[PDB]
From TrEMBL, chain A:
Binding site for Mg(2+) 3: 105, 200
GO CC terms in record: mitochondrial inner membrane; respiratory chain complex I
Name listed for the protein in its UniProt record: NADH-ubiquinone oxidoreductase 75 kDa subunit, mitochondrial
Signal peptide residues on this chain, from the entry's feature table: none
Taxonomic source organism: Sus scrofa
Gene Ontology terms, MF aspect: 2 iron, 2 sulfur cluster binding; 4 iron, 4 sulfur cluster binding; metal ion binding; NADH dehydrogenase (ubiquinone) activity; oxidoreductase activity, acting on NAD(P)H
Annotated positions binding Mg(2+) 4: 105, 200, 203
TrEMBL record, chain B:
Keyword Translocase set for record: yes
GO MF assignments: 2 iron, 2 sulfur cluster binding; metal ion binding; NADH dehydrogenase (ubiquinone) activity; oxidoreductase activity
Protein source organism: Sus scrofa
Protein name: NADH dehydrogenase [ubiquinone] flavoprotein 2, mitochondrial
Domain of life assignment: Eukaryota
Stretch list, region Disordered: 181-217
Gene Ontology cellular component list: mitochondrial inner membrane; respiratory chain complex I
From TrEMBL, chain C:
UniProt similarity note: Belongs to the complex I NDUFV3 subunit family.
Listed name of the protein: NADH dehydrogenase [ubiquinone] flavoprotein 3, mitochondrial
Organism: Sus scrofa (Pig)
Domain of life: Eukaryota
Purpose of the protein: Accessory subunit of the mitochondrial membrane respiratory chain NADH dehydrogenase (Complex I), that is believed not to be involved in catalysis. Complex I functions in the transfer of electrons from NADH to the respiratory chain. The immediate electron acceptor for the enzyme is believed to be ubiquinone. May be the terminally assembled subunit of Complex I.
Entire protein: shown range: 68 to 110 of 110
Subunit record text: Complex I is composed of 45 different subunits. This is a component of the flavoprotein-sulfur (FP) fragment of the enzyme.
Subcellular location: Mitochondrion inner membrane
TrEMBL record, chain D:
InterPro entries per UniProt: ComplexI_51kDa_subunit (IPR050837), NADH-UbQ_OxRdtase_51kDa_CS (IPR001949), NADH-UbQ_OxRdtase_suF (IPR011537), Nuo51_FMN-bd (IPR011538), Nuo51_FMN-bd_sf (IPR037225), Nuop51_4Fe4S-bd (IPR019575), Nuop51_4Fe4S-bd_sf (IPR037207), SLBB_dom (IPR054765)
GO biological process, one term: mitochondrial electron transport, NADH to ubiquinone
Organism listed in the record: Sus scrofa (Pig)
Protein name according to UniProt: NADH dehydrogenase [ubiquinone] flavoprotein 1, mitochondrial
Lineage: Eukaryota, Metazoa, Chordata, Craniata, Vertebrata
Binding-site residues, [4Fe-4S] cluster 4: 360
Residues involved in FMN 4 binding: 63-64, 73, 91, 94-95, 184, 219, 222
Binding residues for FMN 1: 63-64, 66, 73, 91, 94-95, 102, 182, 184, 217, 219, 222
Length: 230, 217, 43, 433
């Protein structure tokens, strides 16, 4: 066949060429940590949480954007990968606001869960944190941009999935802000989905605000009836 | 310190979509020549020059200018906003007639750049991010400008003034506000990147054409 | 043959449009550009 | 006698850039009088394989700072056509603090650059050359445009370039003040009308480059030395410097030296000989020397005890744990606050970070704050090891090498001047109770 042989933790996997390290690892039930990679969005490669060690390679690679080579052995749980994850989460939490009690993403935060599973347990950051002014993009999506981790998921969704190019980044460096740069409503028939793709509470639902916590809710799987798409 | 400026636009009587901006016909010819430089199907590659052209016609970049560039090149206005806010040579706020940038990076800092900066400050009576009440001078600090060998130095509207002492920069300022234009280059009788005195290399006349060509060619 | 004179004195008389004027002048010398097949990626 | 052991004294006849100081006519007629555009048609008719081999045997390495072997990098683009045009992009961003060589090359010897663009494009099969010049170099850009105009009128570039039947265009593109746009993928993105944010690799520009077409990004000096290597032989180029450190190099000596200057010298010249002979020596004498950054701000610094016998090539400076970089030598004597200088460099890197990836965007600003506190001594000795670990977390985990270049000076300062940091810490401690 065209399939090539790779190794995840010494286990042999046969993958189609072009498959990335993340997909090769997930073929054996291992989920590489991520913040900016979405499988229905274009690859970004900027969050750097997916950094993993390839055996006999001095450098860690971004698993979300690196195609697997023939004969590669991926060490998803070696000391290098763990240290890379801890450093990345340290940098992610250096400027994050202490907002978890008031954040609506409280029990549903990928930042929280991946900090508990892959990061350290304390902080050695002894400076002041950054604060970003909030943007208004309509009555559906509530914006609190101090929680933004700059994964640019919303920008990619709007540009590709929604076909609206209103969202972007202004500035550069630490003072790089996601927004519209002008007072503009992000109107789209699919505009609420940016609430879901946002890993953090930077984008939340305004009608849903403060009403419940995820552990309280009971989930019923059903069908939408507002149109014929079902 | 910090950036100081803001990367969000708030509407204002002097800066709004209805603010009048348009390109002159000669500037439209220049835009046409600029766009011709890039392959067909890739016209966004012209946002960098054209936007700069607007800032050359107007002196700064109002939101209407960004919208005009976006309309001309048929790109979403947010992409033009991103380019305008990312690059530091784009003035999203009006500046003085003479925009003075003083390098304060380590190679320039070693050659007493603070003396030049404070000399400018005491000559003009303004701070590091202000404009004179006559709107003739805007002073700011910038990173390395690529003239480290000729440090300390300043840039004034696409001109380099190198090997400066407080007297030299004061003379440049007081001659500039008299209506003239000082000649660029070092102010130390060096007029190049050569060693300060002696010209230790390249003393012999350069060799003629085909001097060291290998055989067979 | 001399070395006491600086020969890069032309840039003392450059205006704000010299670069773009030179680009306009050079426009007539360039080969036709290749085409991607579309007017824009959004087409 | 073969196998020289000493380097650092080459005569003017072997200097590639013969008008570095702008004492001659930079226009076409002067360049032709100095040997430029000589037998270019024959060189083009030799073939891309011949040019690639001539670059290979010269042992030339990338003069942008990374020191990659130029022959292999330019041969990466020797693939057959697949329907996409091929381009050559010349990097003239020149953003490293301390570097001033490419500026002089462009403003004084632009015809060398144009001829090198033609030759390299023929070697790579490039249809055209895009020259991305720094936005602040307006006079240099207009000089380059004048040179390109003269080359077009003389028939040296354009349709039927030099009469070889090869069509080649040279465009000049100006950036707008972004040091990150010196990164090759960031530069490519800036050409395409986007933000100067680097791309990830793979793909490499030889596969997907500018406009999604095969591309090669090269430095100004690397491209400019190409015609001279082709003409004078290439094997002549390898005779200079040590093995794998061949050729001549342009050095920018700045800081605390009597006469800061840009010079050309044999590659493996000792650093002390370079400073004494051309720069006029350290201010206050060689005994007054404290520290030297040998290759621009991105390289770790070295003290006086290492500068005594160190050679100025890639491998020797790697052995000294600093690297050669762009060969911009910043000299600091014993009268400067070295912590403040390194903090100013860290502030530069903080202001120049593009902000795309987490490690750079957060950690460089964190390091800036920590070094700002270190300058005043407002910290504790455990924070030195904390800062070391932070820098190690930044290094090797970023998309581009701006994170590495922000971590390295901090590591050098910690490695060689920890007692100064601790002394400032204790002075601030007892001064403020
Ligand atoms: N001239 C200046 O103003 C500045 C220079 N620098 C220097 O830039 C250097 C770092 O730049 P990088 O591009 O990240 O170095 P790099 O080692 O990653 O590669 C440099 C060149 O080698 C090519 N290359 C490397 N590996 C390749 C591969 N496996 N396949 C194909 N091509 C490959 C790349 O295409 C690139 O063009 C530093 O050493 C720094 O000193 C840094 C800042 C400013
Ligand atoms: C942050 C950063 C900034 C850079 N700036 C420049 C620059 O200004 N000029 C340059 O020639 N190379 C710069 N480089 C290195 C480029 O990658 C290099 O020029 C390019 O790879 C050409 O390599 P070559 O000299 O081997 O041909 C920079 C690299 C980084 C990481
Ligand atoms: S986004 Fe997540 S980590 Fe941040 S405050 Fe909200 S719940 Fe806490
Ligand atoms: S707002 Fe949310 S989805 Fe958008 S870039 Fe920030 S963290 Fe990512
Ligand atoms: S290391 Fe810094 S400059 Fe380079 S891509 Fe990451 S954030 Fe941008
Ligand atoms: S998930 Fe791979 S870099 Fe973000
Ligand atoms: S440090 Fe001032 S020009 Fe580079
Ligand atoms: Mg959310």
């Amino acid at each position: 066949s065209n399939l090539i042989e790779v190794f995840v933790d010494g286990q042999s996997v046969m993958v189609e060429p072009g498959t990335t390290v993340l997909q090769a690892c997930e073929k054996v039930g291992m989920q590489i940590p991520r913040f900016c990679y979405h499988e229905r969005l274009s690859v970004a490669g900027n969050c750097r949480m997916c950094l993993v060690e390839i055996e006999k390679a001095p450098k860690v690679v971004a698993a979300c954007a690196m195609p697997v080579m023939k004969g590669w052995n991926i060490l998803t749980n070696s000391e290098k990968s763990k240290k890379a994850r801890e450093g990345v989460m340290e940098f992610l939490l250096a400027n994050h606001p202490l907002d978890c009690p008031i954040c609506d993403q409280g029990g549903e935060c990928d930042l929280q869960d991946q900090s508990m599973m892959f990061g350290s347990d304390r902080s050695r950051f002894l400076e002041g944190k950054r604060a970003v002014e909030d943007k208004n993009i309509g009555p559906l999506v509530k914006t609190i941009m101090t929680r933004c981790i700059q994964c640019t998921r919303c920008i990619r969704f709007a540009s590709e999935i929604a076909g609206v190019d209103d969202l972007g980044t202004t500035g550069r460096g630490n003072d790089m802000q996601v927004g519209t740069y002008i007072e503009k409503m992000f109107m789209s028939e699919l505009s609420g989905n940016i609430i879901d793709i946002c890993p953090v509470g930077a984008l939340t639902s305004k009608p849903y605000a403060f009403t419940a916590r995820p552990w309280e809710t009971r989930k019923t799987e059903s069908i939408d009836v507002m149109d014929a798409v079902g | 310190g910090a950036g100081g400026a803001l990367f969000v636009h708030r509407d204002t009587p002097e800066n709004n979509p209805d603010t009048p901006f348009d390109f002159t016909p000669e500037n439209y010819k220049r835009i046409e020549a600029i766009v011709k430089n890039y392959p067909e199907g890739h016209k966004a590659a012209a946002v960098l020059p054209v936007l700069d052209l607007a800032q050359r016609q107007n002196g700064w970049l109002p939101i209407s200018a960004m919208n005009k560039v976006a309309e001309i090149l048929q790109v979403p206005p947010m992409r033009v906003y991103e380019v305008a806010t990312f690059y530091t040579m784009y003035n999203r706020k009006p500046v003085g007639k003479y925009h003075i940038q003083v390098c304060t990076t380590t190679p320039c800092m070693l050659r007493n750049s603070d003396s030049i900066l404070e000399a400018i400050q005491k000559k003009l009576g303004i701070k590091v991010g202000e404009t004179t009440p006559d709107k003739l001078f805007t002073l700011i600090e910038v990173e390395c400008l690529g003239a480290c060998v000729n440090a300390p130095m300043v840039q004034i509207n696409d001109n380099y003034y190198e090997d400066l002492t407080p007297k030299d920069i004061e003379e440049i300022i007081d001659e500039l506000k008299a209506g003239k234009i000082p000649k660029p280059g070092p102010r130390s009788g060096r007029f190049s990147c050569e060693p300060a005195g002696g010209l230790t290399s390249l003393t012999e006349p350069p060799k003629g054409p085909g001097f060291g060509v290998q055989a067979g060619l | 043959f001399d070395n006491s004179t600086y020969r890069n004195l032309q840039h003392h008389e450059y205006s704000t449009y010299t670069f773009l004027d030179l680009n306009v002048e050079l426009s007539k010398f360039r080969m036709p550009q290749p085409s991607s097949g579309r007017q824009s990626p959004r087409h | 006698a073969p196998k020289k052991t000493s380097f650092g004294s080459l005569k003017d006849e072997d200097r590639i850039f013969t008008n570095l100081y702008g004492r001659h006519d930079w226009r076409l007629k002067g360049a032709q009088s100095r040997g430029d555009w000589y037998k270019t048609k024959e060189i083009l008719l030799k073939g891309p394989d011949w040019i690639l081999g001539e670059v290979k045997t010269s042992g030339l390495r990338g003069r942008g700072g990374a020191g990659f072997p130029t022959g292999l990098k330019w041969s990466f683009m020797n693939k057959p056509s697949d329907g996409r045009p091929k381009y050559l992009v010349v990097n003239a961003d020149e953003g490293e603090p301390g570097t001033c060589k490419d500026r002089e090359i462009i403003r004084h010897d632009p015809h060398k650059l144009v001829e090198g663009c033609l030759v390299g494009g023929r070697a790579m099969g490039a249809r055209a050359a895009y020259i991305y010049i720094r936005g602040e170099f307006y006079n240099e850009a207009s000089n380059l445009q004048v040179a390109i105009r003269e080359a077009y009128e003389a028939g040296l570039i354009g349709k039927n370039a030099c009469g070889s039947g090869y069509d080649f265009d040279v465009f000049v593109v100006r950036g707008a003040g972004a040091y990150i746009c010196g990164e090759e993928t960031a530069l490519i993105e800036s050409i395409e009308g986007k933000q100067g944010k680097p791309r990830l690799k793979p793909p490499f520009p030889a596969d997907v480059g500018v406009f999604g077409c095969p591309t090669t990004v090269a430095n100004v000096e690397t491209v400019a030395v190409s015609p001279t290597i082709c003409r004078r032989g290439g094997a002549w180029f390898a005779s200079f410097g040590r093995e794998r450190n061949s050729g001549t190099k342009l050095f920018n000596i700045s800081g605390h030296v009597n006469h800061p200057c840009t010079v050309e010298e044999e590659m493996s010249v000792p650093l002390k000989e370079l400073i004494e002979k051309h720069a006029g020596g350290v201010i206050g004498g060689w005994d007054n020397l404290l520290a030297v950054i040998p290759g621009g701000s991105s390289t770790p610094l070295i003290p006086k005890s290492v500068c005594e016998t160190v050679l100025m090539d890639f491998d020797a400076l790697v052995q000294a744990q600093t690297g050669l970089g762009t060969a911009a030598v910043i000299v600091m004597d014993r009268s400067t606050d070295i912590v403040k200088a390194i903090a100013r460099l860290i502030e530069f890197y903080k202001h120049e970070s593009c902000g795309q990836c987490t490690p750079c965007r957060e950690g460089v600003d964190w390091m800036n704050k920590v070094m700002a506190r270190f300058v005043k001594g407002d910290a504790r000795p455990a924070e030195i090891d904390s800062l070391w670990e932070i820098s190690k977390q930044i290094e090797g985990h970023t998309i581009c090498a701006l994170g590495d270049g922000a971590a390295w000076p901090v590591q050098g300062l910690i490695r060689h001047f920890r007692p100064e940091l601790e002394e400032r810490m204790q002075q601030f401690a007892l001064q403020h109770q």
